Design a protein around this nucleic acid. Structure first.
Lengths: 88, 90, 127, 56, 26, 101, 168, 102, 119, 144, 50
RNA sequence: UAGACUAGCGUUGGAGCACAUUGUUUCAUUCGAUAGUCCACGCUCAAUCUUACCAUAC
RNA sequence: GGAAGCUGGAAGACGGAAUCGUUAUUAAGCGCCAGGUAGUCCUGGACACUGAAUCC
RNA sequence: UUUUUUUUUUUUUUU
RNA sequence: CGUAGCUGUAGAUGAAUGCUAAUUAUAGAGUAU
RNA sequence: UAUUGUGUUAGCAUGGUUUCGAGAACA
RNA sequence: UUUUUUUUUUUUUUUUU
């Protein structure tokens, strides 16, 4: 899903309105997260590297009174970060 | 007779039944759900230890009447409701 | 292994390679932090702008050093939660072992004042 | 008031990360070891199962 | 360490760690 | 704080009730389908768009050297998918060293 | 099975005026029910003071060295009045105090002369309450922001692993 | 006659009181460190009366299948009779309990 | 037989110096820093000047001086009765070495800056 | 010298509980002993209610399927059996969703498990003539 | 159909009081008054449950 | 054919816990009586809680 | 409550009489810790070394 | 080991 | 590891270790001579 | 994730479980 | 390696103003 999304969104800049005459080559290479700084990802935390990647580890209770719990409000934040900090 | 359970992914969620008080058949919890929902708090994403703590005050202040809201350090029952709302907006 | 022949020919990749100094990043953080926490930042505002203890009437209140009194004593007492506001009247010497609370208690004292006045005379004055 | 930078956040800013799986970050041999607990469904989590060390 | 057996053990133990404690009585 | 809490027996007045009304509903919804296809839907209805603009994207790689291919997540995937529709497409003498493709 | 605290076996802060807590001929309390704090009652007072002037040359030298010094020594007073009771002067004067509702603890006492002075100063003390009300509004705005909390990072949070980034 | 149903203990006021202090200490555990930090920085030793009723030492061992507050271990969490009945009912065999050895 | 240090001639109370050749136990460390207080105070640049009287050489040998030195030295070798087996006391020279080097105290042998080390 | 006969002596008398490879067992038994009584009391009761009304039992199930999915996927003609109701009970043990592919409960997508109508090997096997506690509803009687 | 689970220890106790209710003689008015509000109705048929 | 004998060796003092006589508004309800379900009893540890007791009051 | 420095003229060389029992890595000495969920015993539990004699 | 050492021993382990 | 072996002192008629103006450590609190 | 009163007369001579003290197990 | 969101007593729970 995350490979197709990047590719599909990139075709918009390649469709004609042989060579590109080196004028609009950077346009297609600017709308992707690879060659983009990670400083604007969160205005409340201006830093280079703050966010990591989420894991695929199963979570939750097999059967109990708390089946529909999942992750807590505060737990979801650390699930998408490399590691917790104490700068906030 | 019984409400549906459309959880995420699966088709059964015991958490919503307990907080709503439909399965446990606990009158104190049934009246608590209609009260917090009107205040605008996300009760569905609350801890198990905190839901019972608030429910105890609702029943205690009902049978004996709203005349003993005393708490340690001079705390009012309204402060807890406001504080919890911020942590659980809607 | 890094090739410098590609980053020089493209501006998009140059930004990623460039590492802004901490000074530039810290400047932006201050603005964002203040905007979010607009209603926070000051804790102790009963600084000397009004000097603590009392400011309206000070000196010779309850120090049992001479006959009669000179002036009264009024100030505010912080509540246990730090949100409520109530006045204060009682002041023995600095510690204030006894507090008269807000005017709710002082009102009853005036009503009971004539009752005690007529009782103390016939209580033990004549014996 | 003061707004200092924590040491943990400082390290994050200064870190040359790789650009995709085919790029070698380090330039020396290194072995990574970690203990993973596997077994029947336990009612409680087993502690002391999050160690990670590197040898060279 | 109330008796002379356990109490003297503490003094002897410290003597092997690079300390000198008087011994003498008890 | 969490060490002392682990004592005594748990509560007994919070068990699941054996209600017949909820039993029938569970059985009825047990045979539901799984029409998720979250990943397949994204790929589907996408190959046609590339085929329409096949000539437009043909010149993209001609003006870009192999050394410039630094962003593989967006470029390597695009090149691989493009070759699926057109197995034969010799653009120039240089080619991948059997590593990136 | 020893005691919990050793502070109860010591004399606390001096009360200035000494009054016998257990009453013998006390009247009946009135009012002071809704408040349930600081009940009003009448009792008998007993003033006491010490003037170190009539002491002998032997004991006066040591007493002054402990009282008028950089720091207090032996509480800045002699032991029990085994021989100094001759110079002790005490005058009986009716007084009153307040006690806690449930705790039943003595707070403080006031002399009869000081009680009458309060009545004469009623006009002077009543007007002083108006000044406090003026600052009530000013302090409300400054004391409300006295709560330090961490900056909220979530912002109704995104799932920003790689995608979404074009969505932003 | 009929040995007790070991899953559900009988009523006991003293047993319930011990668990009450556990919840109070957990919430106040954060405040305990703050009181020690302020005194350490200033360099003055003073008492903390507030910790008397919410202290960690107020709680002590108790028998779950019981209500006595003596003769309870941290491994079994049961009294003399609690372990005897549990072991004789055939419940510890799965957990590696061989009574053959002394 | 009854040697000090045991079979392995242990020494968990002495600290070596990088410069010159001189070692002393932790007992003498307290006296050295207190005696050389004038140099330390002047190095940095009343409540601050509280230990001035303790700098006297004769006062340390009196009854009052003997108690002051013992108060600071808590005898780290002595501990609780339950500290048995693997839970045994280690060499406390790690903390002493840091303070002795940061305070910039001169060595009695040769006047030098921070040159002490664990040993 | 017996080496194998004296194995484990070191970690019996000269080792701490928190500094050894031995794991606690009380935690697992806490949630295991309680669940046994739940299945015993509610076991026969659930089956009795299911068998109370023999005929017309499948009508309720058929109508319920028309509201959840709408189209009856398991529809069959009048000359074919619909289904067989199995008395199941809910799960009370708070098991963790482990990532073990060989587990029997990690892949559970429902809060109900089958119950054995008959067992030949009782789990709570006594070591003597003693009975199981809580298995005597009727009070006793004495000759008097 | 509803069937609320109850403590097994309470089941045997319920029958003990009910057995001697209409069979044997029970002394004291308070025992009958308080005993006629806990074991007189089935746990599943109660209006309120703790 | 045990105890009885033949070796070794711990005691009529000063000290720790406990039973008991004498104090107590409260000084922990108690076992067993003479070869012992008797003295660290269900004290595998009492400086608050463990504590059942008395005082005080809601 | 535990331990330590200093100080030291607390009460004891009485009795070869008598009562408690050991089936030998027994008896007699000496040394170490595991639990008792802060410290907190001379008892109980538990390991190791020297290890004699008699008619039992 | 004739340019070698410079010395007491424990209660799980070289699988 | 303790009594070691070995080896200096007095081949002890005088080695008893409790009493306490005073400090070491745990603990929220164990204080006054 | 606490939740169905009583730590009170009455156990040797009517008691369920456990156990101390004395006696016994052979063809 | 990076220094600031606003602010009136000798009378900082000890002094005859």
């Amino acid at each position: 899903n995350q490979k197709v999304t990047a590719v599909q969104h990139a075709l918009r800049q390649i469709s004609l309105d042989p060579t590109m005459d080196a004028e609009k080559v950077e346009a297609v290479l600017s709308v992707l997260p690879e060659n983009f700084p990670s400083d604007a990802l969160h205005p409340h935390h201006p830093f280079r590297n703050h966010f990591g990647f989420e894991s695929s580890v199963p979570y939750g209770v097999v059967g109990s009174i708390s089946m529909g719990k999942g992750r807590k409000k505060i737990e979801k934040e650390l699930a998408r970060l490399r590691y917790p900090t104490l700068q906030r | 007779p019984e409400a549906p359970q459309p959880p995420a992914g699966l088709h059964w969620s015991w958490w919503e039944l307990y907080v709503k008080g439909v399965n446990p058949e606990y009158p104190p919890r049934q009246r608590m759900f209609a009260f917090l929902t009107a205040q605008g708090v996300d009760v569905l994403e609350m801890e198990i230890r905190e839901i019972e703590d608030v429910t105890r005050w609702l029943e205690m202040s009902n049978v004996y009447g709203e005349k003993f809201p005393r708490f340690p350090y001079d705390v009012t029952f309204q402060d807890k409701i406001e504080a919890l709302k911020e942590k659980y907006p809607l | 292994e890094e090739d410098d022949s590609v980053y020089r020919q493209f501006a998009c990749m140059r930004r990623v390679r460039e590492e802004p100094r901490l000074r530039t990043a810290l400047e932006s953080f201050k603005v964002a932090s203040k905007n979010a926490t607009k209603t926070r930042g000051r804790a102790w505002s009963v600084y000397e702008g009004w000097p603590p203890r009392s400011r309206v009437r000070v000196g010779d209140e309850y120090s049992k050093v001479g006959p009669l009194q000179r002036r009264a004593f009024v100030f505010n007492r912080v509540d246990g939660t730090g949100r409520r506001r109530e006045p204060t009247l009682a002041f023995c010497c600095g510690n204030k072992p006894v507090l008269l609370l807000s005017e709710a208690e002082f009102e009853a004292l005036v009503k009971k004042l004539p009752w005690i006045k007529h009782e103390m005379a016939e209580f033990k004055k004549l014996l | 008031g003061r707004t200092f930078v924590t040491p943990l956040t400082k390290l994050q800013h200064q870190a040359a990360l790789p650009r995709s799986p085919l790029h070698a970050r380090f330039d020396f041999p290194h072995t990574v070891h970690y203990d993973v607990f596997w077994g029947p469904p336990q009612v409680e989590e087993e502690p002391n199962k999050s160690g990670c060390w590197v040898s060279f | 360490c109330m008796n002379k057996k356990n109490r003297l053990a503490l003094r002897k133990r410290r003597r092997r760690m690079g300390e000198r404690v008087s011994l003498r009585y008890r | 704080g969490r060490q002392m809490m682990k004592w005594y027996w748990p509560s007994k007045y919070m068990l699941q009730d054996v209600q017949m009304a909820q039993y029938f509903q569970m059985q009825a919804m047990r045979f539901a389908p799984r029409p998720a296809h979250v990943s397949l839907t994204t790929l589907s209805a996408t190959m046609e768009q590339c085929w329409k603009k096949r000539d437009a994207v043909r010149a993209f790689f001609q003006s870009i050297d192999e050394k410039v291919l630094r962003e593989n997540p967006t470029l390597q995937d695009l090149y691989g998918l493009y070759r699926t529709l057109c197995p034969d497409d010799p653009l120039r003498t240089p080619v991948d060293p059997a590593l990136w493709r | 099975t020893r005691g919990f605290r050793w502070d109860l076996c010591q004399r606390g802060r001096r009360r200035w005026v000494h009054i016998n807590y257990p009453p013998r001929n006390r009247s009946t309390v009135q009012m002071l029910d809704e408040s349930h704090e600081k009940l009003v009652f009448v009792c008998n007072g007993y003033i006491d003071r010490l003037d170190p002037r009539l002491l002998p040359e032997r004991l006066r030298k040591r007493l002054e060295r402990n009282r008028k010094a950089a720091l207090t020594r032996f509480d800045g007073k002699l032991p029990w009045g085994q021989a100094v009771e001759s110079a002790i002067k005490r005058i009986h004067t009716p007084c009153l105090a307040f006690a806690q509702a449930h705790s039943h603890h003595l707070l403080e006492a006031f002399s009869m002369a000081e009680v009458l002075e309060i009545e004469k100063l009623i006009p002077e003390i009543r007007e002083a309450f108006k000044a406090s009300k003026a600052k009530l509004a000013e302090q409300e705005a400054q004391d409300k922001f006295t709560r330090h909390v961490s900056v909220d990072l979530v912002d109704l949070k995104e799932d920003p692993v790689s995608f979404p980034f074009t969505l932003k | 006659l009929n040995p007790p149903p070991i899953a559900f203990p009988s009523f006991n006021r003293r047993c319930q009181k011990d668990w009450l202090a556990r919840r109070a200490f957990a919430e106040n555990e954060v405040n305990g460190r703050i009181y020690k930090n302020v005194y350490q920085n200033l360099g003055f030793k003073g008492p903390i009366p507030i910790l008397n009723k919410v202290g960690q030492y107020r709680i002590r061992m108790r028998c779950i299948s019981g209500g006595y507050s003596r003769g309870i271990f941290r491994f079994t969490r049961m009294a003399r009779m609690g372990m005897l009945q549990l072991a004789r009912e055939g419940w510890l065999k799965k957990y590696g309990y061989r009574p053959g050895l002394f | 037989a009854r040697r000090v240090g045991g079979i392995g001639r242990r020494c968990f109370l002495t600290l070596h110096c990088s410069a010159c050749s001189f070692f002393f136990q932790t007992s003498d460390a307290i006296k050295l820093i207190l005696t050389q207080q004038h140099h330390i105070l002047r190095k940095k640049g009343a409540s601050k000047f509280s230990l001035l009287p303790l700098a006297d050489a004769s006062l340390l040998l009196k009854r009052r001086g003997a108690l002051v030195l013992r108060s600071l030295h808590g005898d780290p070798l002595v501990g609780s009765r339950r500290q048995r087996g693997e839970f045994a006391p280690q060499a406390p020279t790690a903390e002493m070495a840091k303070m002795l080097n940061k305070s910039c105290v001169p060595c009695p042998r040769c006047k030098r800056e921070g040159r002490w080390e664990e040993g | 010298a017996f080496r194998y006969r004296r194995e484990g002596q070191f970690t019996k008398f000269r080792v701490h509980f928190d500094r050894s490879g031995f794991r606690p067992y009380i935690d697992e038994l806490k949630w295991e002993i309680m669940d046994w009584h739940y299945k015993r009391a509610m076991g026969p009761q659930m089956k009795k209610t299911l068998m109370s009304y023999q005929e017309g039992s499948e009508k309720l199930q058929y109508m319920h399927d028309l509201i959840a999915l709408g189209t009856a996927k398991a529809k069959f003609p009048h000359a074919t059996k619909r289904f067989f109701f199995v008395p199941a009970l809910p799960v009370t043990i708070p098991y963790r969703r482990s990532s073990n592919p060989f587990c029997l409960l990690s892949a559970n997508k429902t809060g109900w498990l089958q119950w054995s109508p008959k067992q030949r090997v009782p789990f709570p096997q006594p070591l003597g003539k003693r009975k199981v506690g809580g298995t005597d509803p009727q009070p006793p009687v004495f000759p008097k | 159909a509803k069937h609320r689970f109850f403590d097994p220890l309470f089941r045997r106790r319920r029958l003990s009081f009910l057995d001697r209710f209409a069979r044997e003689r029970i002394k004291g008015e308070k025992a009958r008054q308080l005993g006629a509000q806990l074991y007189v109705k089935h746990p599943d048929q109660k209006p309120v449950w703790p």
